[PDB]
Design a protein around this ligand. Structure first.
Ligand code: ZN
Lengths: 51, 140, 50, 1113, 99, 148
RNA sequence: AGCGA
C-alpha cells in the first residue's frame, strides 16, 4: 500500500552562482494593472500574455 | 510567507475579495483535473501547472527549459514557471464568481452574524439569500 | 453587565478611569468551573484547538 | 471412567460423582444451525423427532414468505419452490489452495402464472453459488477461512417495566412491543394517571381514541374494560368519542398532511399492524407474545402478525400491572402472572445463529431482487416473458458475498491452536449489525444476570474493551429452535431423581426450582438431608425442603465454557485470574513435540476430537499402510480408505499445522477413534504446552514482578520451540510503459546474490534467506528520465547500461530470515483466475524455527502470565539433592495477592503424579482415602491424572497423596509431606536455609513473541497528505509521541527536546535532510524550521477566507 | 498449601452466627419485619462473622509464616486477601451494588 | 436592552477594528493548493482523489453554467435558480451538512468539506497536534534488569 | 475489521 507522484527529485539543492541571464517583461492588463513575468536572454517575449 | 523564528503575533482576520485575488496566482475556470489518457494535469484546471507550479522539479509542461540554470523564469509557450516541485504545496488559486455569494458561517451559525448586523431574523434572511423572497434595500 | 473579566484588567481599567472623571465599575468575585475558565482564555488559537 | 474414543489414554479421574448426560457435540451450534438453513435430511429427521408438525428450512421459509409476487394489476404472479443444491464444485483443500470460495450452486423451481389467460411457466433457475460450511463448522471464502459468530440480540415481543417518578413517587408502568420489521408502540401511565399511548414515537394518545379506532368505541370499552379504573378515567380524558371520529383525528396525527379520510385510516392500521408483508413479529415474536399473554395455549405457530385480541389483552395486562394484579386468566387462554419483564434475562435475549443471520441476509437480497422483478413485471411485454427473463440473481449473490466478506460477524478464523479454533466458534457476540456497539453497549449489559447459569459462562470474556459483550456458550447448552438457549436438567419427582433429561429455557428455569448436582444422592434417586441448597426465580439462593425440588443440575461444570473447563482446580482460583487464564489458554502456540499435560481435566480428549484438527477413523477396521503422508484403512467389508494428512500447512496466524500418525501398520482401529495427532494434540488429547519442573522461590531478583527464569535445558532440548510460516507475495502486472517481467536480468547487482535464484526468477526451495535478500527477480519499465550529469559520467566510465526498466524486486523485509518451504506460482499462460492487468502472480512461503528467547511470554493455566527475565545456564540453577535442576522459577510475591493458589495445588498434584504414589492400605484404608475411587490407591511414575473442575482433588486428599510419594531410584523422598524440598544453590553452592516448594507445572508458550514486537526506525517511509513518518511494524514508522508525552516533557521543561521531536524528526521537510547531512558530516544540528501540519493548517484557514498572518511587532 | 493454615475455631464461629441468621430469617418468616430490614440484619450479622473469622486467623498465624510475613512487611497485599485465601470470603456484591 | 447588547457586541466588534463588513459576502472563492487535495494513484491505476475536488468541480460547473446563462440571456426563473444552486454549492464547499441535507457521495457517505477538516476529534487540531510519529525511534518488550 | 498492555 503506497503511492507516488509524477515529479522530479532533482537533487541539486540551490545555486545562486549562475542564473541563466534573464530580463523581465511586463504585460499591462485592461484595467491599468501590471504583472511582471521574468524572461531569459534567449526568451522570445510574447505580444500578449496570460497575466 | 517565509521567515525565521521572528514571531510576536498571529493575527486572524476576515478576508476581502481584493485580498483573495491578490493571494492567488491564477484563476481556475475549468472543472477538470487530469487528462485521462496521458495522466497529466489539464491546462486551466484544478491542477494546472501554470497556475499551481510544476509537478516536476526544474521542469516545464512542454520541456523547454528543464534545468536549474533556468529558474525563476516562465516558459513562454506552456507558461509554467520553472522552479522546485513543492510550490504546489503552497500556491493557491481563486474562482471569480459571476454572482456574489454569502458566506455560510456568518449566516447560519447561531447566533446569525448577518442577522445581528442588519437586524434581520434568520428565518427571514434564509428566504432572501436562498431566493425565496425579495428585499427592499433603499427608499426615496 | 454580566460579562466576566480578569481581575488584573478590571483593576487596571479602574485605575485608568478614576482619572478623566471618576466612576467605578462594580465587580464581584466569581467561582467558575474549569471548562468555562479554560474556554474563556485570551488566545484564539488555544480556544479553537479546544 | 471415560469411554467413546477407544484409544483415549487411561487418565484417572478424581470425580466423586457420575454424570448421566455425555458432553454434546461441541460444534452442533454451528453444524445443526447450518443444516437447518439448508434442509439436510439429518435435520429433517431430527425435527421429525422433536416437533415434526412443520419441517421447514430457512430457504423454504424465505421463498414461501416471498411467494407469490403480484403486480399492481394483479393479472399475473410469480412464485418459487423447492430449493435444491448440487454437489460442491471443488473440494476443501483445492478451494483453500487456489483461493476459491468453497460453495455449491442453488437451484430453485420458479413459476410464473398469468391470471387473465392462464398458464404456468416453470423452470429450474440457477439462483447463485452459495458458500457451504465444512465439516469443522467453518466457511472458506477466497481461500481464507472464516467463522460466523452467533449474535445475541433482544428478542422481539412485549416488554413490561415501570419507573419511579421522584417528583411524584408513583410507579409508572409501561410496555414496549418491539417486533422485527415493524413499528414502536408505548402504552404507559403519565405522571397524571392516564393511559398514554404513543404510536411509532408520536405524541402519546388517549387509549380511548385507539379503541374506537379498533372498533371498540367508548361503548365497547365499557363492554370489555370494567375493572379498568384508569380506563374509565381516560374515558373521561378521552377528549372525544366515536369510531370514525377517533379514527379521523388519530389518523390526522398518524399521517399528518394527508387527508384524514376514514378509508385511508382503516387501510393504514391494516397495512401497519396486520399486513404481514409490511409487518411481522416473526415466529419467535408470535410465540413470545402468545406465551406472555397466554392467548394460544398450543395453537400451531403461524400468523406472524399482531391481533386485535393481542392489543386489547396488552392493554388489559398493562392496566392490571398498575393494579398490581396477581395474574390475568385471559378469556379463552390461561392465567399468566402479571410481572414486568427484564431486558437481559435470557428469556428476552435470543441468539441468532449462522442460520438466522444468513437467512436474514438472503431475505434482504430477495427484497432487492423482488423490487427489480416487480418493476420489470409491468414494463416487459406480456405473452413474451419467463422467470429466466424476470429474475435477477446479481443482488442476491452480492448480498451473500457482502455478508461473508466485510462484516463484523464474518470474522477471520482465529486458529493459532486447536482450542482457539474451537472457541472462536461457539462464541456469542452482542455487538453486530442490529446490535449494541460499544458506544451504546455500556456497563448495564456487561454484568452477569443470574439467568446466565448453564447458558453462558461467566468467566470467559476478552479482557480488552469488550468485557461481557463477547462471551462463550456453556458446555451443555443447546439452542432453542427459536434462538433461545435451552439447558439440560435432571427432573426429580417426589424426591426421586429420575434420568428424564428435559431442556428448559430461562422462563421455565424461573418458573421451577433448581437443585445442585453435588448433593447427597443416596444411590436411589433420593436426597439425604431435607434442607437442600436451591435457586429461586430471581437468582435467590435458599434451603428448600427436599420435597419441592423438581429439577436438579445435570452435573457441575455446567455453568462454564469449553476452554475454562480445562483449567484444573478452577474452583480455587479467583474469577479475575481464572478469566485471564481462560483468555490465554487460547493463545498457546503449537510446539514441535506437544507433550500431554500430567494433571488435567476430562475436557482434553473430548475438546480435542471435537475440535476437528484430529483425524478420526470414520469406520472400524484394520490398518493397511501408514506413512508420514497418508493412512490406508481396510474396513471390515471390502472397502479401503486413504486419510490424507496435512503436513506443514500454514494456519491463519502463521503457525504450523502438522498432523502425524500414531498407529502401526498392524493395529486395529474402531470407529470414532483418534488416528492422527494434530498441532497441539498428543495421543488424542489436548497438549497446549509442556510439563516443567518449577520452583516458587524468588531468585536474585530476576523473577521480580511477574518475570520468569528458565533453564538452558528448554533451549537445548528444544522443549519450547515454535515453527512459524510467513507468506510473501508479488504480482507482475501491466503498466503504461509496457509489461513487468519476472526474470534474472536484474539491473546493477553482483552475481553473488543471484546464486540462489532459479533460472527464471524465484528462489530455489530450501535456500536460507536473511533480511534484505532477493526472492523474486522482477523488473518494471521506467520510461525515459534525463540523468544527472554525475551518474551520466559514472555510466560513461563504468560502461553500465541505462536499464530503462527500473527494478522493484521482492526483497524479504527487515529482521526476518529462515527457510523457504514452498513456492506457489500462478500465471496468465496457465489461464488461472487473475485480476485485470496482472500477468503473473507468485507467492513464496518462508519458515523459521523460533526457539524460546528472553522477553517471550509464558503462562500457566491460572492466569499467572509473565515474560522471561533470563535464561540461565543449566549449572547456575537450584538443583535438588538428586542433581536434577529445576526448569523454571516463578516468584512467590505474585501468588498471595492474586488469589490463584490453583497453581500451587496444581504444582503439588503434578509432583505427586510425576513421582507416583502408593497409599499403603495395609490395615484397611486411611481416613482421607475412604472416598477416593479405586485404582487411585497407587500410581506409576509419570502417570496422567485428571481433576474435573468443580468436583476434584480435595485438600485432605492432596495432603494424603503427598504423604506417600514413593522414591525415585534410591531411597530418597525428595519432597516431604509438606510439599517442599531442600534446594542447593547452583550458583554459590550452599544449601538454601529453608525448604522450597517444587513440583511439576504445565505451562504454555504465548503468542506474544519478541521477534514479532521489537521494532526500530532511523529513517523510513513517510505519510502522504501530512509529511509525518508512517506507522506500523508492517512498515517502519515511528512511535506516536502523543499528547500526554508532550505534557511530561513540558513539565520537565525540556523545550529543546520537544522542539526536536515535533519539528525535525516528524515534519520539517527541508530540515530532516539537513539534519541527516549534518549527522553524517559531523557538523551541528540545524535550527528547526516550521512544522508541516502548521503550514497545512495555515493553508486551510486561508482557503476558508480567514486572513491568518504572522506579525513581527 | 501446608503454609496456608485454616483457623481451627471457624466451624464454631460459623455455627454461632448461623444460629443468629436462622433467628432473623424466622422472624422475617413470621412477619415481624419486612424484606429490606431482614436483609440489613443478615448483612450486619455476616459482617460480624467475617470480622470474627479474620480476628481468629490473625491471632492464629505465627510470625514466620511467609504469607503473614509478606503482608506485615508492607511488601504488598492487605490482610483481607489473606482472610479470603484462608477462612472467609465474606459478603459478595450484587451487580446493582447491594450485598 | 438585552437584544441591544447581543447586537452591539458584533456591531462594536466591527467598528473598533479596520474590518469592513464587505467580506461577509464573497466574490472570489480561493482554492486550496493541490498537494493538500491530491489525487495520488495507487499501484494499479486506482486513483485516490481527496473529496474536495468534487466540490470544487461542482462550484466550477455551476459558475460556468451561470456565466453562459447570463451571456446568452435567460429568464428570471432559470437565472435565480442557477444562483441558488451556486449558493448551495459554495455552502457545501465550506461546510457540508450544515444547512439542509448533507451532500452525499457514493455509498450515501457525506463528503468532507473544509469545516470538517477542523471540527471534531479528527480535525487537524488533533490528528497531528495530539501527537506525531517521530523518526529515530523504536520499541520493544521489557524485562527486569537487576544487575544494572 | 480483529487483537495486546
Ligand atoms: Zn514550456
Amino acid at each position: 500500500l503506497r503511492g507516488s507522484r509524477l515529479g522530479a527529485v532533482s537533487y541539486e539543492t540551490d545555486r545562486n552562482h549562475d542564473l541563466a541571464p534573464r530580463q523581465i517583461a511586463r504585460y499591462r492588463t485592461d484595467n491599468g494593472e501590471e504583472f511582471e513575468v521574468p524572461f531569459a536572454d534567449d526568451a522570445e517575449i510574447p505580444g500578449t500574455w496570460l497575466c | 510567507m517565509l521567515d525565521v523564528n521572528f514571531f510576536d503575533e498571529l493575527r486572524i482576520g476576515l478576508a476581502t475579495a481584493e485580498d483573495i485575488r491578490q493571494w492567488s496566482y491564477g484563476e481556475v475556470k475549468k472543472p477538470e483535473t487530469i487528462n485521462y489518457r496521458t495522466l497529466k494535469p489539464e491546462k486551466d484546471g484544478l491542477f494546472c501547472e501554470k497556475i499551481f507550479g510544476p509537478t516536476r522539479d526544474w521542469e516545464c509542461y512542454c520541456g523547454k527549459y528543464k534545468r536549474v540554470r533556468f529558474k525563476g523564469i516562465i516558459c513562454e509557450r506552456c507558461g509554467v514557471e520553472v522552479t522546485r516541485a513543492k510550490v504546489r504545496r503552497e500556491r493557491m488559486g481563486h474562482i471569480e464568481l459571476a454572482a456574489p455569494v454569502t458566506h455560510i458561517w456568518y449566516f447560519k451559525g447561531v447566533p446569525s452574524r448577518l442577522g445581528y448586523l442588519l437586524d434581520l431574523a434568520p428565518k427571514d434572511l434564509e428566504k432572501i439569500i436562498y431566493f425565496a423572497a425579495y428585499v427592499i434595500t433603499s427608499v426615496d | 453587565p454580566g460579562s466576566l473579566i480578569d481581575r488584573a484588567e478590571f483593576e487596571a481599567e479602574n485605575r485608568r478611569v478614576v482619572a478623566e472623571g471618576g466612576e467605578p465599575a462594580a465587580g464581584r468575585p466569581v467561582l467558575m468551573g474549569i471548562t468555562k475558565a479554560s474556554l474563556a482564555t485570551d488566545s484564539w488559537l488555544s480556544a479553537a484547538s479546544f | 471412567s471415560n469411554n467413546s474414543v477407544p484409544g483415549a489414554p487411561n487418565r484417572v479421574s478424581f470425580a466423586k460423582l457420575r454424570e448421566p448426560l455425555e458432553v454434546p457435540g461441541l460444534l452442533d451450534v454451528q453444524t445443526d444451525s447450518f443444516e437447518w438453513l439448508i434442509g439436510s435430511p439429518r435435520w429433517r429427521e431430527s425435527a421429525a423427532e422433536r416437533g415434526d408438525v412443520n419441517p421447514v428450512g430457512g430457504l423454504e421459509e424465505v421463498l414461501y414468505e416471498l411467494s407469490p409476487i403480484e403486480d399492481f394489476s394483479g393479472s399475473m404472479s410469480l412464485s418459487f419452490s423447492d430449493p435444491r443444491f448440487d454437489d460442491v464444485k471443488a473440494p476443501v483443500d483445492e478451494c483453500k489452495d487456489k483461493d476459491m470460495t468453497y460453495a455449491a450452486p442453488l437451484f430453485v423451481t420458479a413459476e410464473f402464472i398469468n391470471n387473465n389467460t392462464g398458464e404456468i411457466k416453470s423452470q429450474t433457475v440457477f439462483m447463485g453459488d452459495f458458500p457451504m460450511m465444512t465439516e469443522k463448522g467453518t466457511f472458506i471464502i477466497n481461500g481464507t477461512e472464516r467463522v460466523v459468530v452467533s449474535q445475541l440480540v433482544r428478542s422481539p415481543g412485549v416488554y413490561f417495566d415501570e419507573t419511579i417518578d421522584k417528583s411524584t413517587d408513583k410507579t409508572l408502568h409501561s410496555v414496549k412491543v418491539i417486533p422485527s420489521r415493524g413499528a414502536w408502540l408505548e402504552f404507559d401511565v403519565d405522571k397524571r394517571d392516564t393511559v398514554g399511548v404513543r404510536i411509532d414515537r408520536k405524541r402519546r394518545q388517549p387509549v380511548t381514541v385507539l379503541l374506537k379506532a379498533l372498533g371498540w368505541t367508548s361503548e365497547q370499552i365499557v363492554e370489555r374494560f370494567g375493572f379498568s379504573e384508569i380506563m374509565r378515567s381516560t374515558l373521561e380524558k378521552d377528549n372525544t368519542v366515536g369510531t370514525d371520529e377517533a379514527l379521523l383525528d388519530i389518523y390526522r396525527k398518524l399521517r399528518p398532511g394527508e387527508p384524514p379520510t376514514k378509508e385511508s385510516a382503516q387501510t393504514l392500521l391494516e397495512n401497519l399492524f396486520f399486513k404481514e408483508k409490511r409487518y411481522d413479529l416473526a415466529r419467535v415474536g408470535r410465540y413470545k407474545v402468545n406465551k406472555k399473554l397466554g392467548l394460544h395455549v398450543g395453537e400451531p405457530i403461524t400468523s406472524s402478525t399482531l391481533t386485535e385480541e393481542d392489543v386489547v389483552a396488552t392493554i388489559e395486562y398493562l392496566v392490571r400491572l398498575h393494579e398490581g394484579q396477581t395474574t390475568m386468566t385471559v378469556p379463552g387462554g390461561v392465567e399468566v402472572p402479571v410481572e414486568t419483564d427484564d431486558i437481559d434475562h435470557f428469556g428476552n435475549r435470543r441468539l441468532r445463529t449462522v442460520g438466522e443471520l444468513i437467512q436474514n441476509q438472503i431475505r434482504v437480497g430477495m427484497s432487492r431482487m423482488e423490487r427489480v422483478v416487480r418493476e420489470r413485471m409491468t414494463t416487459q411485454d406480456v405473452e413474451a416473458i419467463t422467470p429466466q427473463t424476470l429474475i435477477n440473481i446479481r443482488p442476491v449473490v452480492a448480498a451473500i458475498k457482502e455478508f461473508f466478506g466485510t462484516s463484523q460477524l464474518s470474522q477471520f478464523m482465529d486458529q493459532n491452536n486447536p482450542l482457539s479454533g474451537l472457541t472462536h466458534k461457539r462464541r456469542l457476540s452482542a455487538l453486530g449489525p442490529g446490535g449494541l456497539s460499544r458506544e451504546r453497549a455500556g456497563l448495564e449489559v456487561r454484568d452477569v444476570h443470574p439467568s446466565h447459569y448453564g447458558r453462558m459462562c461467566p468467566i470467559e470474556t476478552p479482557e480488552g474493551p469488550n468485557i461481557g459483550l463477547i462471551g462463550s456458550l456453556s458446555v451443555y447448552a443447546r439452542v432453542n429452535p427459536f434462538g433461545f438457549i435451552e439447558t439440560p436438567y435432571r427432573k426429580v419427582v417426589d424426591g426421586v431423581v429420575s434420568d428424564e433429561i428435559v431442556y428448559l429455557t430461562a422462563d421455565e428455569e424461573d418458573r421451577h426450582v433448581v437443585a445442585q448436582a453435588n448433593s447427597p444422592i443416596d444411590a436411589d434417586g433420593r436426597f439425604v438431608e431435607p434442607r437442600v441448597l436451591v435457586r429461586r426465580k430471581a437468582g435467590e439462593v435458599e434451603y428448600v425442603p427436599s420435597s419441592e425440588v423438581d429439577y436438579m443440575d445435570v452435573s457441575p461444570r455446567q455453568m462454564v465454557s469449553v476452554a475454562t473447563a480445562m483449567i484444573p482446580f478452577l474452583e480455587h482460583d479467583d474469577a479475575n485470574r481464572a478469566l485471564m487464564g481462560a483468555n490465554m489458554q487460547r493463545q498457546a502456540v503449537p510446539l514441535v513435540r506437544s507433550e500431554a499435560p500430567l494433571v488435567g481435566t476430562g475436557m482434553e480428549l473430548r475438546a480435542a476430537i471435537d475440535a476437528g484438527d484430529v483425524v478420526v477413523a470414520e469406520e472400524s477396521g484394520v490398518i493397511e499402510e501408514v506413512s508420514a503422508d497418508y493412512i490406508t484403512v481396510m474396513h471390515d467389508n471390502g472397502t479401503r480408505r486413504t486419510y490424507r494428512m496435512r503436513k506443514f500447512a500454514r494456519s491463519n496466524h502463521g503457525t504450523c499445522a502438522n498432523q502425524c500418525p500414531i498407529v502401526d501398520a498392524g493395529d486395529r482401529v474402531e470407529a470414532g477413534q483418534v488416528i492422527a495427532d494434530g498441532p497441539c494434540t498428543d495421543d488424542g488429547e489436548m497438549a497446549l504446552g509442556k510439563n516443567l519442573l518449577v520452583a516458587i522461590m524468588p531468585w536474585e531478583g530476576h523473577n521480580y514482578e511477574d518475570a520468569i527464569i528458565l533453564s538452558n535445558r528448554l533451549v537445548e532440548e528444544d522443549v519450547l520451540t515454535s515453527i512459524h510460516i510467513e507468506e510473501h507475495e508479488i504480482d507482475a502486472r501491466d503498466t503504461k510503459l509496457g509489461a513487468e517481467e519476472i526474470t534474472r536480468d536484474i539491473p546493477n547487482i553482483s552475481d553473488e546474490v543471484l546464486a540462489d535464484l532459479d533460472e527464471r526468477g524465484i528462489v530455489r526451495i530450501g535456500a536460507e534467506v536473511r533480511d534484505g535478500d532477493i526472492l523474486v527477480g522482477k523488473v518494471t519499465p521506467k520510461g525515459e528520465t534525463e540523468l544527472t550529469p554525475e551518474e551520466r559520467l559514472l555510466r560513461a566510465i563504468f560502461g553500465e547500461k541505462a536499464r530503462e526498466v527500473r527494478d522493484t524486486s521482492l526483497k524479504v523485509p527487515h529482521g526476518e530470515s529462515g527457510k523457504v518451504i514452498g513456492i506457489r506460482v500462478f500465471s496468465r499462460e496457465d489461464e488461472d483466475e487473475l485480476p485485470a492487468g496482472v500477468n503473473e502472480l507468485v507467492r513464496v512461503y518462508v519458515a523459521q524455527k523460533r526457539k524460546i528467547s528472553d522477553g517471550d511470554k509464558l503462562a500457566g493455566r491460572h492466569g499467572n502470565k509473565g515474560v522471561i527475565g533470563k535464561i540461565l545456564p543449566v549449572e547456575d540453577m537450584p538443583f535438588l539433592a538428586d542433581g536434577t535442576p529445576v526448569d523454571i522459577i516463578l516468584n512467590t510475591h505474585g501468588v498471595p495477592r492474586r488469589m490463584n493458589i490453583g497453581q500451587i495445588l496444581e504444582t503439588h498434584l503434578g509432583w505427586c503424579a510425576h513421582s507416583g504414589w502408593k497409599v499403603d492400605a495395609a490395615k484397611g484404608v486411611p481416613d482421607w482415602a475412604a472416598r477416593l475411587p479405586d485404582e487411585l490407591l497407587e500410581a506409576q511414575p509419570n502417570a496422567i491424572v485428571s481433576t474435573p473442575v468443580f468436583d476434584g482433588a480435595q485438600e485432605a486428599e492432596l495432603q494424603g497423596l503427598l504423604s506417600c510419594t514413593l522414591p525415585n531410584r534410591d531411597g530418597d523422598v525428595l519432597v516431604d509431606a509438606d510439599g517442599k524440598a531442600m534446594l542447593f544453590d547452583g550458583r554459590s553452592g550452599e544449601p538454601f536455609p529453608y525448604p522450597v516448594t517444587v513440583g511439576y507445572m504445565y505451562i504454555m508458550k504465548l503468542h506474544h513473541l519478541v521477534d514479532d514486537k521489537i521494532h526500530a526506525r532511523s529513517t523510513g517511509p513517510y505519510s502522504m497528505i501530512t509529511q509525518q513518518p508512517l506507522g506500523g511494524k508492517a512498515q517502519f514508522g515511528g512511535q506516536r509521541f502523543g499528547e500526554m508525552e508532550c505534557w511530561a516533557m513540558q513539565a520537565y521543561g525540556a523545550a529543546y527536546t520537544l522542539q526536536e521531536l515535533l519539528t525535525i524528526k516528524s515534519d520539517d521537510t527541508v530540515g530532516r535532510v539537513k539534519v541527516y547531512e549534518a549527522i553524517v558530516k559531523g557538523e551541528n544540528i540545524p535550527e528547526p524550521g516550521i512544522p508541516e501540519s502548521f503550514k497545512v493548517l495555515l493553508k486551510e484557514l486561508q482557503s476558508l477566507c480567514l486572513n491568518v498572518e504572522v506579525l513581527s511587532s | 498449601m501446608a503454609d496456608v493454615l485454616v483457623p481451627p475455631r471457624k466451624k464454631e464461629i460459623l455455627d454461632h452466627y448461623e444460629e443468629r441468621a436462622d433467628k432473623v430469617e424466622k422472624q422475617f418468616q413470621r412477619g415481624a419485619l419486612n424484606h429490606d430490614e431482614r436483609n440489613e440484619a443478615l448483612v450486619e450479622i455476616w459482617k460480624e462473622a467475617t470480622d470474627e473469622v479474620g480476628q481468629a486467623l490473625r491471632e492464629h498465624y505465627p510470625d514466620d509464616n511467609p504469607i503473614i510475613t509478606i503482608v506485615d512487611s508492607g511488601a504488598t497485599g492487605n490482610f483481607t486477601q489473606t482472610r479470603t485465601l484462608a477462612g472467609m470470603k465474606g459478603l459478595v456484591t450484587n451487580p446493582k451494588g447491594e450485598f | 436592552k438585552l437584544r441591544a447588547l447581543k447586537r452591539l457586541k458584533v456591531v462594536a466588534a466591527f467598528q473598533q477594528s479596520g474590518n469592513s463588513p464587505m467580506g461577509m459576502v464573497l466574490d472570489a472563492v480561493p482554492v486550496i493548493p493541490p498537494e493538500l487535495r491530491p489525487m495520488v494513484q495507487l499501484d494499479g491505476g486506482r486513483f485516490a482523489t481527496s473529496d474536495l475536488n468534487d466540490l470544487y468541480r461542482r462550484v466550477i460547473n455551476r459558475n460556468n453554467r451561470l456565466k453562459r446563462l447570463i451571456d446568452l440571456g435567460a429568464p428570471e426563473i432559470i437565472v435565480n435558480n442557477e444562483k441558488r444552486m451556486l449558493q448551495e454549492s459554495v455552502d457545501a464547499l465550506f461546510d457540508n451538512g450544515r444547512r439542509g441535507r448533507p451532500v452525499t457521495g457514493p455509498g450515501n457517505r457525506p463528503l468532507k468539506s473544509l469545516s470538517d477538516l477542523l471540527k471534531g476529534k479528527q480535525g487537524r487540531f488533533r490528528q497531528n497536534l495530539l501527537g506525531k510519529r517521530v523518526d529515530y525511534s523504536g520499541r520493544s518488550v521489557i524485562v527486569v534488569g537487576p544487575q544494572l
